[model samples]
Target: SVLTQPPSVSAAPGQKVTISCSGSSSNIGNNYVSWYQQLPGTAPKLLIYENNKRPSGIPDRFSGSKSGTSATLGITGLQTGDEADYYCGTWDSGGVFGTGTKVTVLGQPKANPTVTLFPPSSEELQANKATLVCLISDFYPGAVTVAWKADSSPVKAGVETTTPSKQSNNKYAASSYLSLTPEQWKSHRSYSCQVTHEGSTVEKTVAPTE
Candidate 1:
């Protein structure tokens, strides 16, 4: 896609938020602009098209416009239910869309969880064996996926990932385990755990102490 948006944007309820989508002259200034709203686990809903016209059934609180080779999506009187990802599109050489902007309406307070890579202890390293743990805790929304990579190569064996479970604070926690032997740990190879949740992906890596 020729257009780019900020990774994420946040606002409080009853406030307003405007996300900008930058484009090239070949796209934004030449073709009509369109916008979409996408809720998690659902298909995208068209918010506006042709620069500034909302489709039928769309609320007036959401708006779109174009100026100076860029397009903007504005939302007013934000509600908690309005929290979703937004995207902009225009004709490039072909149809192109922006990398989605996640609209987060701060209802209460959602804190980013602590992500840690727990490698085996020194003694275990001396034994040439270790169990890598990708531990994610104190997160909300209760949905996440963990993927493993070794030296940039995807790892597919001896991997176990648990679904997010309830925590004491009513948040969520998840764990992924990868076991490695001496042959896999001896070199300078590094292991990475990528966690995707709440429209964001966080990566943390652990390397063998060579």
Candidate 2:
């Protein structure tokens, strides 16, 4: 069996929790490790894979990491929308679960709300401004939240939100947008998006144009 950390995460309804999965061998050798989030009465959604590649329709905020023989699933920026049971799965000679790992999303809090971002990437218009979008795809049991940082500095402007998109397979997606000046984009800054779910946190960062 695989090695897993605290099987469950509980919060005040709309808080975030993180679930970690560690393996005995390098999942990277297999070129992939996938994570899923399951609600009380629903199926699982392919959250993270290949240690960092998000499926076309999945959110970038949900990410994975692999070091040596271990891997982790981090959910950041918690929300009630994130309440659910989270799990990590991978294709080995077959599939296996980490030993004693069970993740749980708690109930929602009045101050906590589901957060989301969309698009994941964007383009610019010459020397004026560059825009990128991120989305929160889905969370179970409660709400989700999203945050943005540019060059490691928190962004307080040019943030927008929208409803999450759903797939024929029944998974969900959410979106957010960011705008920055061309000068800012050229300053060798790094842009990062973070999502908190079930008490776990995952983040994606992009370096400025060189």
Best by lDDT: 1
C-alpha lDDT of residue 202 in model 1 = 89
As for candidate 1, its clashing pairs are none
> Candidate 1, which ten residues in sequence have the lowest lDDT sum?
104-113
Query: What is the alpha-carbon lDDT of model 1 when measured against the actual structure?
Result: 0.79
Candidate with the greatest TM-score versus the true structure: 1
Residue-level lDDT tens digits of model 1 in 103-204: 767654665667898876778878767788999998765556678888788888668987567588877688999888856755536888888776678889
lDDT of each: 0.79, 0.57
lDDT of 2 by residue, 1-210 (tens): 555655455544334455666556644345456777765568877777666677887655566787666677766656545655566666755666443333333332222223433322334545366776665554542333567787667887777755344444344456667776656656646777776554556576666543
- The number of residue pairs in model 1 that clash at the backbone is 0
lDDT of 1 at 7: 51
